[PDB]
């Protein structure tokens, strides 16, 4: 698809068998989703945003569908109001920015 | 241009007579620039994201050239860790996400 930016670029994702809404975010290096349970072991990670740094849980090799495209990769879980799809998975679905 | 997302989508901007590097950020509602002086009136605003909220100054009707494309809109100035071009200006240069 071709998505304009007059509104937030929200799409549906499916993770752990659940539908959720998430933001396609070219300014996020990594994908960060709201607290939920995921399978397997996690590793610690620090990420920095507009207000400072926080601790999140890093889960590798997680299956996630994004706007109907299958991806498998790293998902960080932490306290956020929004699910954010960052560049590590935008590249797996072939997304580019165009103007 | 078509910008892939293997790396951060960084571009040159010109604002307030200054050349800067900034991140094209579809996840940002607003454009936020590191501390600098801008002409005109401003009012305080709080903006939040990973890590919490920061206080910024909101300047309206500011012109920015983004990778060679002129746009006008509101610009927030504050202690952001990176210059961010958000959707309020991305729309003006006709930027889209495609996959
Ligand atoms: C390394 O991987 C990542 C690191 C940091 C982020 S991020 O979310 O901090 N961010 C990186 C940017 C800021 C350099 C992605 C942004 O696009 C962010 C994504 C984004 C979109 C929508 C809501 C929130 C958000 C997150 C919160 O987490 C606690 C709290 C919150 O409260 C309002 C808002 C975050 N939006 C944003 O910061 O917008 C403003 C600059 C205008 C504030 C994402 C992945
Ligand atoms: Cl200055
Ligand atoms: Cl604006
Ligand atoms: Cl348009
Ligand atoms: Na003004």
JSON list of C-alpha atoms and ligand atoms in Angstrom, two decimals:
[
{"chain": "A", "resi": 1, "resn": "UNK", "atom": "CA", "xyz": [0.00, 0.00, 0.00]},
{"chain": "A", "resi": 2, "resn": "UNK", "atom": "CA", "xyz": [0.79, 3.70, -0.12]},
{"chain": "A", "resi": 3, "resn": "UNK", "atom": "CA", "xyz": [0.18, 5.33, 3.26]},
{"chain": "A", "resi": 4, "resn": "UNK", "atom": "CA", "xyz": [-0.01, 9.11, 3.71]},
{"chain": "A", "resi": 5, "resn": "UNK", "atom": "CA", "xyz": [0.78, 10.83, 6.96]},
{"chain": "A", "resi": 6, "resn": "UNK", "atom": "CA", "xyz": [-2.13, 13.16, 7.61]},
{"chain": "A", "resi": 7, "resn": "UNK", "atom": "CA", "xyz": [-3.05, 10.73, 10.36]},
{"chain": "A", "resi": 8, "resn": "UNK", "atom": "CA", "xyz": [-1.01, 8.31, 12.44]},
{"chain": "A", "resi": 9, "resn": "UNK", "atom": "CA", "xyz": [0.10, 5.39, 10.24]},
{"chain": "A", "resi": 10, "resn": "UNK", "atom": "CA", "xyz": [-1.68, 2.75, 12.28]},
{"chain": "A", "resi": 11, "resn": "UNK", "atom": "CA", "xyz": [-1.95, -0.80, 11.01]},
{"chain": "A", "resi": 12, "resn": "UNK", "atom": "CA", "xyz": [-3.14, -4.11, 12.42]},
{"chain": "A", "resi": 13, "resn": "UNK", "atom": "CA", "xyz": [-0.58, -6.60, 13.69]},
{"chain": "A", "resi": 14, "resn": "UNK", "atom": "CA", "xyz": [-1.03, -10.12, 14.95]},
{"chain": "A", "resi": 15, "resn": "UNK", "atom": "CA", "xyz": [1.22, -11.45, 17.62]},
{"chain": "A", "resi": 16, "resn": "UNK", "atom": "CA", "xyz": [0.69, -14.37, 19.96]},
{"chain": "A", "resi": 17, "resn": "UNK", "atom": "CA", "xyz": [-2.58, -14.99, 18.08]},
{"chain": "A", "resi": 18, "resn": "UNK", "atom": "CA", "xyz": [-3.90, -11.57, 19.12]},
{"chain": "A", "resi": 19, "resn": "UNK", "atom": "CA", "xyz": [-4.87, -8.63, 16.93]},
{"chain": "A", "resi": 20, "resn": "UNK", "atom": "CA", "xyz": [-3.44, -5.30, 17.98]},
{"chain": "A", "resi": 21, "resn": "UNK", "atom": "CA", "xyz": [-3.00, -1.88, 16.43]},
{"chain": "A", "resi": 22, "resn": "UNK", "atom": "CA", "xyz": [0.55, -0.61, 15.86]},
{"chain": "A", "resi": 23, "resn": "UNK", "atom": "CA", "xyz": [2.37, 2.47, 14.52]},
{"chain": "A", "resi": 24, "resn": "UNK", "atom": "CA", "xyz": [4.67, 2.20, 11.49]},
{"chain": "A", "resi": 25, "resn": "UNK", "atom": "CA", "xyz": [7.58, 4.25, 12.86]},
{"chain": "A", "resi": 26, "resn": "UNK", "atom": "CA", "xyz": [10.57, 5.14, 10.71]},
{"chain": "A", "resi": 27, "resn": "UNK", "atom": "CA", "xyz": [12.11, 6.97, 13.66]},
{"chain": "A", "resi": 28, "resn": "UNK", "atom": "CA", "xyz": [12.27, 3.80, 15.80]},
{"chain": "A", "resi": 29, "resn": "UNK", "atom": "CA", "xyz": [15.31, 1.56, 15.36]},
{"chain": "A", "resi": 30, "resn": "UNK", "atom": "CA", "xyz": [13.56, -1.33, 17.04]},
{"chain": "A", "resi": 31, "resn": "UNK", "atom": "CA", "xyz": [10.04, -2.61, 17.55]},
{"chain": "A", "resi": 32, "resn": "UNK", "atom": "CA", "xyz": [8.49, -1.98, 20.97]},
{"chain": "A", "resi": 33, "resn": "UNK", "atom": "CA", "xyz": [5.18, -3.36, 22.04]},
{"chain": "A", "resi": 34, "resn": "UNK", "atom": "CA", "xyz": [2.96, -2.98, 25.07]},
{"chain": "A", "resi": 35, "resn": "UNK", "atom": "CA", "xyz": [3.27, -5.45, 27.93]},
{"chain": "A", "resi": 36, "resn": "UNK", "atom": "CA", "xyz": [2.20, -8.95, 26.95]},
{"chain": "A", "resi": 37, "resn": "UNK", "atom": "CA", "xyz": [3.48, -12.50, 27.38]},
{"chain": "A", "resi": 38, "resn": "UNK", "atom": "CA", "xyz": [5.74, -13.95, 24.73]},
{"chain": "A", "resi": 39, "resn": "UNK", "atom": "CA", "xyz": [7.39, -17.38, 24.53]},
{"chain": "A", "resi": 40, "resn": "UNK", "atom": "CA", "xyz": [11.01, -18.12, 25.28]},
{"chain": "A", "resi": 41, "resn": "UNK", "atom": "CA", "xyz": [13.80, -16.40, 27.14]},
{"chain": "A", "resi": 42, "resn": "UNK", "atom": "CA", "xyz": [14.38, -12.62, 27.13]},
{"chain": "A", "resi": 43, "resn": "UNK", "atom": "CA", "xyz": [17.50, -10.46, 27.48]},
{"chain": "A", "resi": 44, "resn": "UNK", "atom": "CA", "xyz": [17.83, -7.00, 28.97]},
{"chain": "A", "resi": 45, "resn": "UNK", "atom": "CA", "xyz": [17.96, -3.89, 26.84]},
{"chain": "A", "resi": 46, "resn": "UNK", "atom": "CA", "xyz": [17.95, -0.14, 27.29]},
{"chain": "A", "resi": 47, "resn": "UNK", "atom": "CA", "xyz": [16.24, 2.13, 24.78]},
{"chain": "A", "resi": 48, "resn": "UNK", "atom": "CA", "xyz": [16.22, 5.91, 24.61]},
{"chain": "A", "resi": 49, "resn": "UNK", "atom": "CA", "xyz": [13.30, 8.03, 23.50]},
{"chain": "A", "resi": 50, "resn": "UNK", "atom": "CA", "xyz": [12.14, 11.65, 23.75]},
{"chain": "A", "resi": 51, "resn": "UNK", "atom": "CA", "xyz": [12.23, 11.72, 27.54]},
{"chain": "A", "resi": 52, "resn": "UNK", "atom": "CA", "xyz": [15.21, 9.49, 28.39]},
{"chain": "A", "resi": 53, "resn": "UNK", "atom": "CA", "xyz": [16.20, 5.82, 28.65]},
{"chain": "A", "resi": 54, "resn": "UNK", "atom": "CA", "xyz": [14.20, 2.82, 29.90]},
{"chain": "A", "resi": 55, "resn": "UNK", "atom": "CA", "xyz": [14.59, -0.90, 30.48]},
{"chain": "A", "resi": 56, "resn": "UNK", "atom": "CA", "xyz": [12.70, -3.29, 28.23]},
{"chain": "A", "resi": 57, "resn": "UNK", "atom": "CA", "xyz": [12.61, -7.03, 27.65]},
{"chain": "A", "resi": 58, "resn": "UNK", "atom": "CA", "xyz": [14.22, -8.23, 24.43]},
{"chain": "A", "resi": 59, "resn": "UNK", "atom": "CA", "xyz": [12.66, -11.36, 22.83]},
{"chain": "A", "resi": 60, "resn": "UNK", "atom": "CA", "xyz": [14.31, -12.71, 19.71]},
{"chain": "A", "resi": 61, "resn": "UNK", "atom": "CA", "xyz": [12.85, -14.54, 16.76]},
{"chain": "A", "resi": 62, "resn": "UNK", "atom": "CA", "xyz": [9.20, -13.75, 17.43]},
{"chain": "A", "resi": 63, "resn": "UNK", "atom": "CA", "xyz": [6.55, -14.35, 14.74]},
{"chain": "A", "resi": 64, "resn": "UNK", "atom": "CA", "xyz": [4.53, -11.28, 13.98]},
{"chain": "A", "resi": 65, "resn": "UNK", "atom": "CA", "xyz": [2.26, -10.29, 11.08]},
{"chain": "A", "resi": 66, "resn": "UNK", "atom": "CA", "xyz": [2.20, -6.63, 10.10]},
{"chain": "A", "resi": 67, "resn": "UNK", "atom": "CA", "xyz": [-0.54, -5.29, 7.81]},
{"chain": "A", "resi": 68, "resn": "UNK", "atom": "CA", "xyz": [-0.80, -8.81, 6.36]},
{"chain": "A", "resi": 69, "resn": "UNK", "atom": "CA", "xyz": [2.98, -9.31, 5.90]},
{"chain": "A", "resi": 70, "resn": "UNK", "atom": "CA", "xyz": [4.77, -12.06, 7.84]},
{"chain": "A", "resi": 71, "resn": "UNK", "atom": "CA", "xyz": [7.89, -11.10, 9.76]},
{"chain": "A", "resi": 72, "resn": "UNK", "atom": "CA", "xyz": [10.03, -12.97, 12.32]},
{"chain": "A", "resi": 73, "resn": "UNK", "atom": "CA", "xyz": [12.40, -10.98, 14.43]},
{"chain": "A", "resi": 74, "resn": "UNK", "atom": "CA", "xyz": [13.20, -9.15, 17.62]},
{"chain": "A", "resi": 75, "resn": "UNK", "atom": "CA", "xyz": [10.42, -7.61, 19.68]},
{"chain": "A", "resi": 76, "resn": "UNK", "atom": "CA", "xyz": [11.02, -5.45, 22.77]},
{"chain": "A", "resi": 77, "resn": "UNK", "atom": "CA", "xyz": [8.33, -5.41, 25.45]},
{"chain": "A", "resi": 78, "resn": "UNK", "atom": "CA", "xyz": [7.95, -2.45, 27.78]},
{"chain": "A", "resi": 79, "resn": "UNK", "atom": "CA", "xyz": [5.50, 0.06, 29.22]},
{"chain": "A", "resi": 80, "resn": "UNK", "atom": "CA", "xyz": [4.25, 2.15, 26.28]},
{"chain": "A", "resi": 81, "resn": "UNK", "atom": "CA", "xyz": [0.74, 3.37, 25.23]},
{"chain": "A", "resi": 82, "resn": "UNK", "atom": "CA", "xyz": [1.42, 2.42, 21.69]},
{"chain": "A", "resi": 83, "resn": "UNK", "atom": "CA", "xyz": [2.77, -0.58, 19.86]},
{"chain": "A", "resi": 84, "resn": "UNK", "atom": "CA", "xyz": [5.64, 0.67, 17.66]},
{"chain": "A", "resi": 85, "resn": "UNK", "atom": "CA", "xyz": [6.91, -1.14, 14.54]},
{"chain": "A", "resi": 86, "resn": "UNK", "atom": "CA", "xyz": [10.46, 0.05, 13.95]},
{"chain": "A", "resi": 87, "resn": "UNK", "atom": "CA", "xyz": [13.01, -0.39, 11.24]},
{"chain": "A", "resi": 88, "resn": "UNK", "atom": "CA", "xyz": [14.10, -3.90, 12.13]},
{"chain": "A", "resi": 89, "resn": "UNK", "atom": "CA", "xyz": [10.65, -5.15, 11.01]},
{"chain": "A", "resi": 90, "resn": "UNK", "atom": "CA", "xyz": [9.76, -2.41, 8.48]},
{"chain": "A", "resi": 91, "resn": "UNK", "atom": "CA", "xyz": [12.70, -3.72, 6.45]},
{"chain": "A", "resi": 92, "resn": "UNK", "atom": "CA", "xyz": [11.27, -7.28, 6.57]},
{"chain": "A", "resi": 93, "resn": "UNK", "atom": "CA", "xyz": [7.99, -6.09, 5.07]},
{"chain": "A", "resi": 94, "resn": "UNK", "atom": "CA", "xyz": [9.80, -4.07, 2.39]},
{"chain": "A", "resi": 95, "resn": "UNK", "atom": "CA", "xyz": [8.76, -0.60, 3.52]},
{"chain": "A", "resi": 96, "resn": "UNK", "atom": "CA", "xyz": [10.34, 2.54, 2.17]},
{"chain": "A", "resi": 97, "resn": "UNK", "atom": "CA", "xyz": [9.76, 6.26, 2.68]},
{"chain": "A", "resi": 98, "resn": "UNK", "atom": "CA", "xyz": [9.03, 8.14, -0.57]},
{"chain": "A", "resi": 99, "resn": "UNK", "atom": "CA", "xyz": [8.71, 11.79, -1.57]},
{"chain": "B", "resi": 1, "resn": "UNK", "atom": "CA", "xyz": [13.70, 10.12, -3.42]},
{"chain": "B", "resi": 2, "resn": "UNK", "atom": "CA", "xyz": [12.99, 6.61, -2.19]},
{"chain": "B", "resi": 3, "resn": "UNK", "atom": "CA", "xyz": [14.57, 6.03, 1.20]},
{"chain": "B", "resi": 4, "resn": "UNK", "atom": "CA", "xyz": [15.17, 2.48, 2.41]},
{"chain": "B", "resi": 5, "resn": "UNK", "atom": "CA", "xyz": [15.17, 1.75, 6.10]},
{"chain": "B", "resi": 6, "resn": "UNK", "atom": "CA", "xyz": [18.28, -0.38, 6.60]},
{"chain": "B", "resi": 7, "resn": "UNK", "atom": "CA", "xyz": [19.69, 2.72, 8.30]},
{"chain": "B", "resi": 8, "resn": "UNK", "atom": "CA", "xyz": [18.12, 5.71, 10.06]},
{"chain": "B", "resi": 9, "resn": "UNK", "atom": "CA", "xyz": [16.44, 7.96, 7.46]},
{"chain": "B", "resi": 10, "resn": "UNK", "atom": "CA", "xyz": [18.56, 11.07, 8.07]},
{"chain": "B", "resi": 11, "resn": "UNK", "atom": "CA", "xyz": [18.35, 14.14, 5.84]},
{"chain": "B", "resi": 12, "resn": "UNK", "atom": "CA", "xyz": [19.74, 17.66, 5.74]},
{"chain": "B", "resi": 13, "resn": "UNK", "atom": "CA", "xyz": [17.38, 20.39, 6.81]},
{"chain": "B", "resi": 14, "resn": "UNK", "atom": "CA", "xyz": [17.70, 24.19, 6.96]},
{"chain": "B", "resi": 15, "resn": "UNK", "atom": "CA", "xyz": [15.96, 26.03, 9.77]},
{"chain": "B", "resi": 16, "resn": "UNK", "atom": "CA", "xyz": [16.53, 29.44, 11.29]},
{"chain": "B", "resi": 17, "resn": "UNK", "atom": "CA", "xyz": [19.34, 29.96, 8.77]},
{"chain": "B", "resi": 18, "resn": "UNK", "atom": "CA", "xyz": [21.10, 26.82, 10.05]},
{"chain": "B", "resi": 19, "resn": "UNK", "atom": "CA", "xyz": [21.94, 23.51, 8.37]},
{"chain": "B", "resi": 20, "resn": "UNK", "atom": "CA", "xyz": [21.17, 20.46, 10.51]},
{"chain": "B", "resi": 21, "resn": "UNK", "atom": "CA", "xyz": [20.73, 16.73, 10.26]},
{"chain": "B", "resi": 22, "resn": "UNK", "atom": "CA", "xyz": [17.32, 15.42, 11.12]},
{"chain": "B", "resi": 23, "resn": "UNK", "atom": "CA", "xyz": [15.43, 12.12, 11.32]},
{"chain": "B", "resi": 24, "resn": "UNK", "atom": "CA", "xyz": [12.34, 11.63, 9.13]},
{"chain": "B", "resi": 25, "resn": "UNK", "atom": "CA", "xyz": [10.01, 10.15, 11.75]},
{"chain": "B", "resi": 26, "resn": "UNK", "atom": "CA", "xyz": [6.60, 8.78, 10.79]},
{"chain": "B", "resi": 27, "resn": "UNK", "atom": "CA", "xyz": [6.01, 7.94, 14.47]},
{"chain": "B", "resi": 28, "resn": "UNK", "atom": "CA", "xyz": [6.30, 11.58, 15.52]},
{"chain": "B", "resi": 29, "resn": "UNK", "atom": "CA", "xyz": [3.13, 13.68, 15.43]},
{"chain": "B", "resi": 30, "resn": "UNK", "atom": "CA", "xyz": [5.20, 16.84, 15.76]},
{"chain": "B", "resi": 31, "resn": "UNK", "atom": "CA", "xyz": [8.57, 18.18, 14.60]},
{"chain": "B", "resi": 32, "resn": "UNK", "atom": "CA", "xyz": [11.07, 18.63, 17.46]},
{"chain": "B", "resi": 33, "resn": "UNK", "atom": "CA", "xyz": [14.44, 20.38, 17.11]},
{"chain": "B", "resi": 34, "resn": "UNK", "atom": "CA", "xyz": [17.33, 20.64, 19.51]},
{"chain": "B", "resi": 35, "resn": "UNK", "atom": "CA", "xyz": [17.73, 23.89, 21.43]},
{"chain": "B", "resi": 36, "resn": "UNK", "atom": "CA", "xyz": [18.16, 26.84, 19.12]},
{"chain": "B", "resi": 37, "resn": "UNK", "atom": "CA", "xyz": [16.69, 30.34, 18.84]},
{"chain": "B", "resi": 38, "resn": "UNK", "atom": "CA", "xyz": [13.79, 31.02, 16.48]},
{"chain": "B", "resi": 39, "resn": "UNK", "atom": "CA", "xyz": [12.05, 34.30, 15.74]},
{"chain": "B", "resi": 40, "resn": "UNK", "atom": "CA", "xyz": [8.56, 35.15, 16.91]},
{"chain": "B", "resi": 41, "resn": "UNK", "atom": "CA", "xyz": [6.17, 34.22, 19.64]},
{"chain": "B", "resi": 42, "resn": "UNK", "atom": "CA", "xyz": [6.18, 30.85, 21.39]},
{"chain": "B", "resi": 43, "resn": "UNK", "atom": "CA", "xyz": [4.28, 29.05, 24.08]},
{"chain": "B", "resi": 44, "resn": "UNK", "atom": "CA", "xyz": [5.18, 26.14, 26.36]},
{"chain": "B", "resi": 45, "resn": "UNK", "atom": "CA", "xyz": [4.17, 22.59, 25.66]},
{"chain": "B", "resi": 46, "resn": "UNK", "atom": "CA", "xyz": [4.79, 19.14, 27.19]},
{"chain": "B", "resi": 47, "resn": "UNK", "atom": "CA", "xyz": [5.42, 16.19, 24.90]},
{"chain": "B", "resi": 48, "resn": "UNK", "atom": "CA", "xyz": [5.87, 12.58, 25.90]},
{"chain": "B", "resi": 49, "resn": "UNK", "atom": "CA", "xyz": [7.31, 9.38, 24.51]},
{"chain": "B", "resi": 50, "resn": "UNK", "atom": "CA", "xyz": [9.57, 6.56, 25.65]},
{"chain": "B", "resi": 51, "resn": "UNK", "atom": "CA", "xyz": [11.24, 7.79, 28.82]},
{"chain": "B", "resi": 52, "resn": "UNK", "atom": "CA", "xyz": [8.60, 10.30, 29.83]},
{"chain": "B", "resi": 53, "resn": "UNK", "atom": "CA", "xyz": [7.81, 13.94, 29.02]},
{"chain": "B", "resi": 54, "resn": "UNK", "atom": "CA", "xyz": [9.93, 16.94, 28.16]},
{"chain": "B", "resi": 55, "resn": "UNK", "atom": "CA", "xyz": [9.07, 20.64, 28.13]},
{"chain": "B", "resi": 56, "resn": "UNK", "atom": "CA", "xyz": [9.40, 22.41, 24.80]},
{"chain": "B", "resi": 57, "resn": "UNK", "atom": "CA", "xyz": [8.75, 25.75, 23.22]},
{"chain": "B", "resi": 58, "resn": "UNK", "atom": "CA", "xyz": [6.12, 25.79, 20.48]},
{"chain": "B", "resi": 59, "resn": "UNK", "atom": "CA", "xyz": [6.78, 28.17, 17.60]},
{"chain": "B", "resi": 60, "resn": "UNK", "atom": "CA", "xyz": [4.13, 28.42, 14.86]},
{"chain": "B", "resi": 61, "resn": "UNK", "atom": "CA", "xyz": [4.51, 29.22, 11.15]},
{"chain": "B", "resi": 62, "resn": "UNK", "atom": "CA", "xyz": [8.20, 28.38, 10.89]},
{"chain": "B", "resi": 63, "resn": "UNK", "atom": "CA", "xyz": [9.72, 27.59, 7.51]},
{"chain": "B", "resi": 64, "resn": "UNK", "atom": "CA", "xyz": [11.97, 24.56, 7.10]},
{"chain": "B", "resi": 65, "resn": "UNK", "atom": "CA", "xyz": [13.67, 23.22, 3.99]},
{"chain": "B", "resi": 66, "resn": "UNK", "atom": "CA", "xyz": [13.75, 19.42, 4.22]},
{"chain": "B", "resi": 67, "resn": "UNK", "atom": "CA", "xyz": [16.09, 17.65, 1.82]},
{"chain": "B", "resi": 68, "resn": "UNK", "atom": "CA", "xyz": [15.50, 20.51, -0.62]},
{"chain": "B", "resi": 69, "resn": "UNK", "atom": "CA", "xyz": [11.73, 20.80, -0.14]},
{"chain": "B", "resi": 70, "resn": "UNK", "atom": "CA", "xyz": [10.28, 23.87, 1.61]},
{"chain": "B", "resi": 71, "resn": "UNK", "atom": "CA", "xyz": [7.55, 23.44, 4.20]},
{"chain": "B", "resi": 72, "resn": "UNK", "atom": "CA", "xyz": [5.92, 25.60, 6.86]},
{"chain": "B", "resi": 73, "resn": "UNK", "atom": "CA", "xyz": [4.39, 24.58, 10.15]},
{"chain": "B", "resi": 74, "resn": "UNK", "atom": "CA", "xyz": [4.75, 24.39, 13.91]},
{"chain": "B", "resi": 75, "resn": "UNK", "atom": "CA", "xyz": [8.16, 23.54, 15.27]},
{"chain": "B", "resi": 76, "resn": "UNK", "atom": "CA", "xyz": [8.82, 22.43, 18.85]},
{"chain": "B", "resi": 77, "resn": "UNK", "atom": "CA", "xyz": [12.22, 23.34, 20.35]},
{"chain": "B", "resi": 78, "resn": "UNK", "atom": "CA", "xyz": [13.58, 21.51, 23.40]},
{"chain": "B", "resi": 79, "resn": "UNK", "atom": "CA", "xyz": [16.08, 19.07, 24.86]},
{"chain": "B", "resi": 80, "resn": "UNK", "atom": "CA", "xyz": [15.36, 16.27, 22.39]},
{"chain": "B", "resi": 81, "resn": "UNK", "atom": "CA", "xyz": [18.23, 13.83, 21.83]},
{"chain": "B", "resi": 82, "resn": "UNK", "atom": "CA", "xyz": [17.89, 14.22, 18.05]},
{"chain": "B", "resi": 83, "resn": "UNK", "atom": "CA", "xyz": [16.26, 16.56, 15.50]},
{"chain": "B", "resi": 84, "resn": "UNK", "atom": "CA", "xyz": [12.95, 15.00, 14.42]},
{"chain": "B", "resi": 85, "resn": "UNK", "atom": "CA", "xyz": [10.86, 15.81, 11.35]},
{"chain": "B", "resi": 86, "resn": "UNK", "atom": "CA", "xyz": [7.34, 14.64, 12.30]},
{"chain": "B", "resi": 87, "resn": "UNK", "atom": "CA", "xyz": [4.16, 14.15, 10.35]},
{"chain": "B", "resi": 88, "resn": "UNK", "atom": "CA", "xyz": [3.04, 17.82, 10.47]},
{"chain": "B", "resi": 89, "resn": "UNK", "atom": "CA", "xyz": [5.86, 18.61, 8.04]},
{"chain": "B", "resi": 90, "resn": "UNK", "atom": "CA", "xyz": [6.24, 15.20, 6.33]},
{"chain": "B", "resi": 91, "resn": "UNK", "atom": "CA", "xyz": [2.82, 15.69, 4.83]},
{"chain": "B", "resi": 92, "resn": "UNK", "atom": "CA", "xyz": [3.84, 19.00, 3.29]},
{"chain": "B", "resi": 93, "resn": "UNK", "atom": "CA", "xyz": [6.67, 17.44, 1.31]},
{"chain": "B", "resi": 94, "resn": "UNK", "atom": "CA", "xyz": [4.37, 14.66, 0.17]},
{"chain": "B", "resi": 95, "resn": "UNK", "atom": "CA", "xyz": [6.11, 11.86, 2.05]},
{"chain": "B", "resi": 96, "resn": "UNK", "atom": "CA", "xyz": [4.47, 8.44, 2.04]},
{"chain": "B", "resi": 97, "resn": "UNK", "atom": "CA", "xyz": [5.23, 4.97, 3.42]},
{"chain": "B", "resi": 98, "resn": "UNK", "atom": "CA", "xyz": [5.12, 2.25, 0.74]},
{"chain": "B", "resi": 99, "resn": "UNK", "atom": "CA", "xyz": [5.28, -1.51, 0.94]},
{"chain": "C", "resi": 1, "resn": "LIG", "atom": "C1", "xyz": [15.66, 1.57, 19.62]},
{"chain": "C", "resi": 1, "resn": "LIG", "atom": "O1", "xyz": [14.28, 1.23, 19.41]},
{"chain": "C", "resi": 1, "resn": "LIG", "atom": "C2", "xyz": [13.48, 2.29, 19.69]},
{"chain": "C", "resi": 1, "resn": "LIG", "atom": "C3", "xyz": [13.97, 3.35, 20.46]},
{"chain": "C", "resi": 1, "resn": "LIG", "atom": "C4", "xyz": [13.11, 4.40, 20.79]},
{"chain": "C", "resi": 1, "resn": "LIG", "atom": "C5", "xyz": [11.82, 4.45, 20.30]},
{"chain": "C", "resi": 1, "resn": "LIG", "atom": "S1", "xyz": [10.82, 5.88, 20.52]},
{"chain": "C", "resi": 1, "resn": "LIG", "atom": "O2", "xyz": [9.40, 5.49, 20.62]},
{"chain": "C", "resi": 1, "resn": "LIG", "atom": "O3", "xyz": [11.33, 6.67, 21.68]},
{"chain": "C", "resi": 1, "resn": "LIG", "atom": "N1", "xyz": [10.97, 6.88, 19.24]},
{"chain": "C", "resi": 1, "resn": "LIG", "atom": "C6", "xyz": [12.29, 7.20, 18.78]},
{"chain": "C", "resi": 1, "resn": "LIG", "atom": "C7", "xyz": [12.37, 8.69, 18.41]},
{"chain": "C", "resi": 1, "resn": "LIG", "atom": "C8", "xyz": [11.69, 9.52, 19.50]},
{"chain": "C", "resi": 1, "resn": "LIG", "atom": "C9", "xyz": [13.83, 9.14, 18.26]},
{"chain": "C", "resi": 1, "resn": "LIG", "atom": "C10", "xyz": [9.97, 6.63, 18.21]},
{"chain": "C", "resi": 1, "resn": "LIG", "atom": "C11", "xyz": [9.18, 7.94, 18.03]},
{"chain": "C", "resi": 1, "resn": "LIG", "atom": "O4", "xyz": [8.70, 7.95, 16.69]},
{"chain": "C", "resi": 1, "resn": "LIG", "atom": "C12", "xyz": [8.03, 8.01, 19.04]},
{"chain": "C", "resi": 1, "resn": "LIG", "atom": "C13", "xyz": [7.04, 6.85, 18.90]},
{"chain": "C", "resi": 1, "resn": "LIG", "atom": "C14", "xyz": [5.79, 7.07, 19.76]},
{"chain": "C", "resi": 1, "resn": "LIG", "atom": "C15", "xyz": [4.57, 7.24, 19.13]},
{"chain": "C", "resi": 1, "resn": "LIG", "atom": "C16", "xyz": [3.42, 7.47, 19.89]},
{"chain": "C", "resi": 1, "resn": "LIG", "atom": "C17", "xyz": [3.49, 7.56, 21.27]},
{"chain": "C", "resi": 1, "resn": "LIG", "atom": "C18", "xyz": [4.73, 7.43, 21.89]},
{"chain": "C", "resi": 1, "resn": "LIG", "atom": "C19", "xyz": [4.73, 7.39, 23.29]},
{"chain": "C", "resi": 1, "resn": "LIG", "atom": "C20", "xyz": [5.48, 6.42, 23.94]},
{"chain": "C", "resi": 1, "resn": "LIG", "atom": "C21", "xyz": [5.49, 6.36, 25.34]},
{"chain": "C", "resi": 1, "resn": "LIG", "atom": "O5", "xyz": [6.24, 5.38, 25.92]},
{"chain": "C", "resi": 1, "resn": "LIG", "atom": "C22", "xyz": [6.21, 5.45, 27.35]},
{"chain": "C", "resi": 1, "resn": "LIG", "atom": "C23", "xyz": [4.76, 7.28, 26.06]},
{"chain": "C", "resi": 1, "resn": "LIG", "atom": "C24", "xyz": [4.00, 8.27, 25.41]},
{"chain": "C", "resi": 1, "resn": "LIG", "atom": "O6", "xyz": [3.29, 9.16, 26.14]},
{"chain": "C", "resi": 1, "resn": "LIG", "atom": "C25", "xyz": [2.69, 10.20, 25.37]},
{"chain": "C", "resi": 1, "resn": "LIG", "atom": "C26", "xyz": [3.99, 8.32, 24.02]},
{"chain": "C", "resi": 1, "resn": "LIG", "atom": "C27", "xyz": [5.86, 7.09, 21.15]},
{"chain": "C", "resi": 1, "resn": "LIG", "atom": "N2", "xyz": [7.30, 9.28, 18.91]},
{"chain": "C", "resi": 1, "resn": "LIG", "atom": "C28", "xyz": [7.71, 10.41, 19.50]},
{"chain": "C", "resi": 1, "resn": "LIG", "atom": "O7", "xyz": [8.66, 10.38, 20.30]},
{"chain": "C", "resi": 1, "resn": "LIG", "atom": "O8", "xyz": [7.06, 11.54, 19.16]},
{"chain": "C", "resi": 1, "resn": "LIG", "atom": "C29", "xyz": [7.44, 12.81, 19.64]},
{"chain": "C", "resi": 1, "resn": "LIG", "atom": "C30", "xyz": [8.91, 13.14, 19.40]},
{"chain": "C", "resi": 1, "resn": "LIG", "atom": "C31", "xyz": [6.62, 13.93, 18.93]},
{"chain": "C", "resi": 1, "resn": "LIG", "atom": "C32", "xyz": [7.12, 12.86, 21.13]},
{"chain": "C", "resi": 1, "resn": "LIG", "atom": "C33", "xyz": [11.36, 3.40, 19.53]},
{"chain": "C", "resi": 1, "resn": "LIG", "atom": "C34", "xyz": [12.15, 2.29, 19.28]},
{"chain": "C", "resi": 2, "resn": "LIG", "atom": "CL1", "xyz": [20.88, 29.24, 17.87]},
{"chain": "C", "resi": 3, "resn": "LIG", "atom": "CL1", "xyz": [1.90, 22.30, 11.76]},
{"chain": "C", "resi": 4, "resn": "LIG", "atom": "CL1", "xyz": [-1.38, 13.81, -0.06]},
{"chain": "C", "resi": 5, "resn": "LIG", "atom": "NA1", "xyz": [5.65, 32.24, 14.70]}
]
